[PDB]
Amino acid sequence: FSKLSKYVETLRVKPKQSIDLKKDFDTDYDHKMLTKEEGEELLNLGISKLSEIQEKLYASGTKSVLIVFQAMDAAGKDGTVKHIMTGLNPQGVKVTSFKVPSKIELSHDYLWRHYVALPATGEIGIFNRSHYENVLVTRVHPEYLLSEQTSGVTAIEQVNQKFWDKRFQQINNFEQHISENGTIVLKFFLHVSKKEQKKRFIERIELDTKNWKFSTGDLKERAHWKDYRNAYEDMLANTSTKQAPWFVIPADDKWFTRLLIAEIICTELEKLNLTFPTVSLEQKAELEKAKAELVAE
Ligand SMILES: Nc1ncnc2c1ncn2[C@@H]1O[C@H](COP(=O)(O)O)[C@@H](O)[C@H]1O
């Protein structure tokens, strides 16, 4: 983990930095410290450690954790969320996968459904797709804004850079408020290359046990790749803060993606210095006494 820990620091997006995904963030790390087999063992320790942290977090009831995932189709997002959940307790973890908004949801501001779904003290909430969709798919297809009664947009011509700027400000305000009121916010962008996306799409199409699930509408979003990259770059450049950071994770090799994310969550949550509750003398005496009754039956 020694070398890996330094590399992980590079994946965080600093507040003042500017973003060029093609040029400066590699979708696949060439100087991988370790073998895939070593990586799998490390990931296994990470999930176990993350599990212990979750238990301490549930037992204290002082903070909540919100973890966000955004990615292009076939970046491994869903599978990564899956792998994390299998390791955790279901009692203090909730996954919400946001999809196209319902009628009721469209009658409220775009943040309302996310605010409603936030994690309570002691629990971890995972957003497999978040409020950031409102500056991503909605920026590429501004026509969706016409179905939002609260957006204030009657024609696509009305939307300019100032509108996305205002949303970035709204989002930053929402995340700063929850950060100041107990929530730890960690955001991950899984960054997959165009080439690798293509290779995964073809693999899915070819497998008779995956292709029932393949949706050809994913191809439409692939054709808007440059539009999405611009949406992603502008968002990362304005919504990553020290309090609520974005991490860009290379997604071309899945085992390495998962390892990176687990390492980063552990490291960030380790700053809370969580411990298990201790047993006091009064509590110790009650336990001994309870044990004495069981023996005397
Ligand atoms: N706020 C939103 N507005 C419009 N579409 C969204 C929003 N949030 C999620 N979606 C879309 O809903 C879909 C989720 O369905 P799936 O990933 O197929 O389960 C993805 O295409 C998202 O981009």
Ligand SMILES: [Cl-]
């Ligand atoms: Cl790119």
